Amino acid sequence: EFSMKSVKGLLFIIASFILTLLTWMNTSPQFMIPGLALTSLSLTFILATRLPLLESWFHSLEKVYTVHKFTAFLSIILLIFHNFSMGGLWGSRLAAQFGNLAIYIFASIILVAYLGKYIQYEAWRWIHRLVYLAYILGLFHIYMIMGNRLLTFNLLSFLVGSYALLGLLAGFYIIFLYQKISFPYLGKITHLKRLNHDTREIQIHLSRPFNYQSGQFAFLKIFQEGFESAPHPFSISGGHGQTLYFTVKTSGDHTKNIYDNLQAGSKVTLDRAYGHMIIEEGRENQVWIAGGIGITPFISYIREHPILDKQVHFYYSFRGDENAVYLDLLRNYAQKNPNFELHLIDSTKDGYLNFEQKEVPEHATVYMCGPISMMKALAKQIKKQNPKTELIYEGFKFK
Template sequence: MKAIKGILFIILTMSSSALLWYFATPIEPIHAVNRLSHIIGGLAITGFFLVFLLATRMKILERWFHGLERLYFHHKWLAIFSLGLVILHGQLQDMVPDWDEAQETPLSEFAKELGELGQYGFIALILIALFAKFLKYEHWRIVHRLFLIPYALGIYHAYFSSRYDLFQPTSLGIFTALTATIGFMSALYMLTMYQDMYFNYKGKITGINKLGSNVIQLELTLDKKIPYRHGQFIFIKIFQDGLEKAPHPFSISGSDGKKVFITIKGLGDFTKKVFHSVQLNTPVALDGPYGHLNFEKGTQQQVWIAGGIGITPFLSYLQSHPADRNIELFYTYHGQDNAIYQEFLQEYAKTNQYFSVNFIDTAQMDRLSFENFSVPAKTSIFMCGPEKMVKRFAKQLKSFNTGADIEYEAFKIR
C-alpha cells in the first residue's frame, strides 16, 4: 500500500489521543457514559487537527501519502469520520445522568452551548463540501476556510466544559495543547500565508497556442528554475482581470526549468475563461511541483494509459527523451477535437522502435477496457486522467495482474 506512512501517521495520532483520554483522571468522579463521551469528543478534536494539517499540502505529508490525490482522499474521509465522532459525542452527552450534569458551572454550560453550535457548523459545512461538484472552485475554497470557526468553538468547548483539567501539564494536557495549536495555526496558515509563502515561482505568460476548439497550451517563463520532474503538476495563479485569482492544478506538458508549458482543456468556468481570454505577458505564480509519476524509476517494460487531457504528463517525458525502454501507450479521448498532440505521438512512434501508441476515440469506438488484459511480469503501469477512469482501469488491471505495479494521477483534487 503506497500511502502506508500517511495511514500509519493517522492511526498513531488517533490511537494516542484515545489512550491519553482513556487513562487520564477526571477532576472528580464522573459517570461511565460521560467518560466515554469525553474520549469520543477528544478523538473528534484530534481528527479535525489532522484534517487541517493535511490541508497544508506539506511536501513531507504528500510523500507519506504518495501523492496529493491520496492525501485528499484521506483528508475527506477523516473529516467525515470526525464529524461522526462529534455527533456521537453529542448523543452521549444527552445520556449523561442528571446527578453528573448537576456539577456543571455557568462557564461550562456556556462552553457546552458553543460546542453544540460548533457541531451544527461542522455538519452544515461538511454537507456543503460533499456537494463540491455543484460549487464554483472559489466558493468551494471559501466553504473550507469557514471550518476554522466550528473548530475554534470545539476547542473552547473542550477546554471549558471538560471534566478533565486540560490546562495542567499532564500528558493529555500537553497533547491537546499541541494538536489544538498546530491545527489552529494550520488553518490560519491556509487562510493568510499560504498564497504568499508557497507561490514563490513568479513569471508571465510568454506563449499561447490553441490546439483545438477547447484546448490551449500556455508557455510560462519564470524568474527562477522550478525543480521539476517529468510527470508532475503545479498549482498556478493567473493574475488577469476577469479570471479567478484562486490557484488551479495543471500537469506540466514540458519544461526546461525556467520555461514551463501547461496544456489546459476548457471544461469548467475557469478553464473556459482561460481558453477564450488569457493574454500574453499576464503575470503568473506557481506552487509545486507535486505528483509521483516517475517514469525513470519504472521498469524497462511500461504501459501508459492517458484519458483526454491526461496525456500531458506523458508528453513532458516524450518531448525531452528518446524512449529507451519498451513503452505502449493507450490514449483514449472522445472526438478528434480532443485528440491533442496526435500528430506528435504518431510521428514519435514512427521514429522510435521502443514506443507504440493506440488511439481510442470513444466517439467512434467502444470504450477502452482492461478486463482480462495481461501484462508481462515486471511491467510498470502509469495512468493519468479523470478519477473514475483511472480507478476503473486500476481495478481491472489488478484483478487480472496480481501484484502489478500501478501508479496514477487523477484529475479530481477536491
C-alpha cells in the same frame, strides 16, 4: 486502495488516536470520546496543508484528501455521540453554548461539503473555511470547561495543547498564508497556442528555475483583468529550467476564460511540483494509457526525453480527430524512437479501449490517466489478465 506507500501516514493517524485514547483513559475516562474527536479534528486540519511531508507519508494528494474526509467524518460522529451523552440542543452557560455552535457549524459544513458539488469551487472553499471558526469555538468551549486541567504540567495538558496548536497553525497557514507565501515561482506568459477547438497551450517564463519530474503537476495562479486568481491544478506538460508548459482543456468557466481571453505578458505564480506518477521511476517495460486531456503528463516525458530509454506501449484514446492533441508530436516521437509503440484509438469510430485480449509485457508498470470510469474498467481488465502488473493512475479531481 491504500497500500504500503501510505503506511507511514497511516501509522501517523493510528498512533495519534491510541496515544490519545491511553491519555484520556489515564486522566479523564469520561472524556475519551470527545477528546479523541479533538485529535480527529486537528489531524483533519493538518491534512489540508498540502505540505511535502504529507505527500511523502500518504504517497499522493488524493490519498491525503481521502484520509482528510475520513477524519472529518470520524470527528463528526464522535462529536454527535458526545453531544447526545452530555447535553441537548442548546446549553445554559457560555462554555456549553460554544460547543453547541461549534457542532452546528461542523455538521452544516460537512453536509455542504459532501452534498455540494455543483457549487462554484471558490464559493465552496469560502463556505468550507468556516471550519476554522467552528474549531476556534470548540477550543474555547474545551478550555472554559476544563479550566485548570489543560493548563498544568501533565500528559493531558501537553497532548491537548499540542494537538490544538497544530490544528490552529495548520488552519491559519492554509487559509491565510499558503496562497501568499507558498507561491514563490513568479512567471510571465510568453506564448499561447490553441491546439484544437477547446485546448490551449500556455508557455511561461519564470524568474527562477523550476524543478519537476515528468508526470507531476503544479498549482497555477493567473493575474489578469477578468481572471480569477485562485490556484488551479494543472499537469506540467513540458519545459525545463525557467520555461514551463501547461496544456489546458475547457472544462468550466475558468478554463474557458483561459482559452478565449488569456494573454501573453500576464503574471502567473506557482508553488511547487506535486505528484506520484513519475514515469522515469518505473520499470523498463511500460504501458502508457491516456484518455483525452489525460495525455498531458505523458507529453511532458516526450518533451523532455528526446531519446527514449524504456520499452513503451502508448495507448491514446480520444473522441474523434478534432479532440486529439499532439498527434504530429507523437508520430515524430514514434518515428525517431523505434522502442516507442503508438496506438491511437478514435473511440468515436473504433469504440472503447478493451484490454482483455491485448497482451501486457511481463514485469511491467502501467500508467493510466483518463476518465475515472475508463481507468476502473481498464484496471479490472489488466488485473484479470495479470495480477503482478504494477498499476499507477492519476485523477484530475480531489473531491
